[PDB]
Amino acid sequence: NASKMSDVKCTSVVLLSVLQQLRVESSSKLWAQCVQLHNDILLAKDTTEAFEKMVSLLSVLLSMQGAVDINK
Amino acid sequence: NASKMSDVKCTSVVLLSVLQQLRVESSSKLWAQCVQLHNDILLAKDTTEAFEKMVSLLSVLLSMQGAVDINKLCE
Amino acid sequence: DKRAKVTSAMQTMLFTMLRKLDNDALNNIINNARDGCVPLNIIPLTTAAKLMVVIPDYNTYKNTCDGTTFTYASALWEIQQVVDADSKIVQLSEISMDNSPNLAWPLIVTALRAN
Amino acid sequence: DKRAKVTSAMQTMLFTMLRKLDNDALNNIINNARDGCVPLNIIPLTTAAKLMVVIPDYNTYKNTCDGTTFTYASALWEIQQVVDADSKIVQLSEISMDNSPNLAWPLIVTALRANSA
Numbered sequence: 001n002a003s004k005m006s007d008v009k010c011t012s013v014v015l016l017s018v019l020q021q022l023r024v025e026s027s028s029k030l031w032a033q034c035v036q037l038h039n040d041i042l043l044a045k046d047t048t049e050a051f052e053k054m055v056s057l058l059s060v061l062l063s064m065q066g067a068v069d070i071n072k
Numbered sequence: 073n074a075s076k077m078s079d080v081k082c083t084s085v086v087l088l089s090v091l092q093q094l095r096v097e098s099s100s101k102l103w104a105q106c107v108q109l110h111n112d113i114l115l116a117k118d119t120t121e122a123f124e125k126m127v128s129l130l131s132v133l134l135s136m137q138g139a140v141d142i143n144k145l146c147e
Numbered sequence: 148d149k150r151a152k153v154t155s156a157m158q159t160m161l162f163t164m165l166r167k168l169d170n171d172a173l174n175n176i177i178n179n180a181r182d183g184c185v186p187l188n189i190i191p192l193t194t195a196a197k198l199m200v201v202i203p204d205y206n207t208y209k210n211t212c213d214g215t216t217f218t219y220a221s222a223l224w225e226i227q228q229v230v231d232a233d234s235k236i237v238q239l240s241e242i243s244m245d246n247s248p249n250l251a252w253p254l255i256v257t258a259l260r261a262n
Numbered sequence: 263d264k265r266a267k268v269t270s271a272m273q274t275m276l277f278t279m280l281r282k283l284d285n286d287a288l289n290n291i292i293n294n295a296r297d298g299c300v301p302l303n304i305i306p307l308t309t310a311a312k313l314m315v316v317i318p319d320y321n322t323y324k325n326t327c328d329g330t331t332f333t334y335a336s337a338l339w340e341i342q343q344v345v346d347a348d349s350k351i352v353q354l355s356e357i358s359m360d361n362s363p364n365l366a367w368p369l370i371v372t373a374l375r376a377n378s379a
Contacts, residue, residue: 003282006282007079007167007168007279008170009271009272009275010083010086010164010279011082011161011164011168013082013085013086013272014082014086014160014161014164015161017089018154018157021150021154039264039268042275043264043267043271051168051172052172054170054173055176055190055192055220055221056189058173058176059188059190059220060189062186063186063187063189065185068158070177070181072162078160078163078167079164079282079283080283081157081160082164083283085157086272086275087276089272090269093269093272102304111149114160115152115153119285123283123287123288124307124379126288127287127288127291127305127307127336128304128305128306128307130280130291130292131301131304131305131335134300135300135301135302135303135304142277142292142295143296145274145276145277146277146296
């Protein structure tokens with residue numbers, strides 16, 4: 001469980017960086033929400049909270065039509 | 073060891089973010105060096121190269137005196 | 148260019164990390180997005196919060212919707228409306244195996260988070 | 263407030279990930295840093311490139327230095343200068359078990375990389 005916690009925290013930092021490179025920062029209020037979710041994951045008490053906040057944060061990336069290609 | 077590659081790359085993104093929060097100046101040569109090291113790790117194809125570049129990138133954090141408490145962070 | 152190569156590597160690593168995490172809710176939203184079932188807003192975490200999702204085809208509809216319940220992100224959602232690509236309402240009875248060829252896909256489902 | 267807590271959480275996670283990677287060169291620099299043996303500049307990667315490191319005590323010096331060779335970060339380094347805490351140059355001949363108590367620790371070693379990575 002603990003190593004899952006470190007991995008999900010690392011992944012949240014990557015996810016925020018991916019959104020940053022996709023220029024989400026220029027959209028100031030969406031960016032503020034993304035930062036807050038990232039912070040919530042880094043401060044998460046347990047893996048349940050971390051993964052719920054990661055669902056919200058990842059959904060930002062999944063909602064960006066054509067910005068990335070999930071199939072690859 | 074191909075199984076560890078994703079973890080080293082993830083860690084390099086974290087390390088660059090930690091350095092950014094510590095106010096390593098954007099205009100600085102050091103910051104440009106940090107970014108290049110991070111990019112090279114992300115583009116690495118074998119763990120030997122990734123780890124050598126991670127040694128250099130991590131040394132930037134280890135060199136910032138009293139900016140971090142390494143013993144505390146490793147408790 | 149160089150920026151694009153780094154970005155590609157970072158995004159690839161992101162999805163490799165997500166796959167290794169192997170969490171039910173993250174897996175669900177990623178697999179749905181791979182099929183074109185994607186959220187239109189940030190997925191919320193509190194009761195009765197709003198969610199809008201693209202449903203691209205009948206197979207995705209049947210795998211995610213039972214009566215007025217939408218199942219997504221390891222949670223249940225109460226369907227409020229289903230609208231077609233022309234923003235016109237679609238009654239649930241119209242969304243059948245035999246009738247789906249006649250609908251203007253994709254559909255957009257609007258739902259509220261349950262318990 | 264929260265900004266300092268987020269920073270602490272990110273830095274702690276960083277070191278947990280590093281520990282999980284379990285690479286010898288990373289472990290060497292981290293464990294040396296925990297002992298106070300820290301680089302003063304970014305570690306270079308090419309043959310004959312320069313590096314400065316704090317050597318906090320004789321126990322570390324004995325663990326890392328033999329003659330003009332410094333072993334650090336899974337690499338060999340040729341020592342160019344040792345200075346003591348009084349900013350005075352220490353000739354390598356004086357850093358001996360018998361003379362170690364007369365030196366002003368910590369020392370700073372300047373070295374050039376011996377081989378390419």
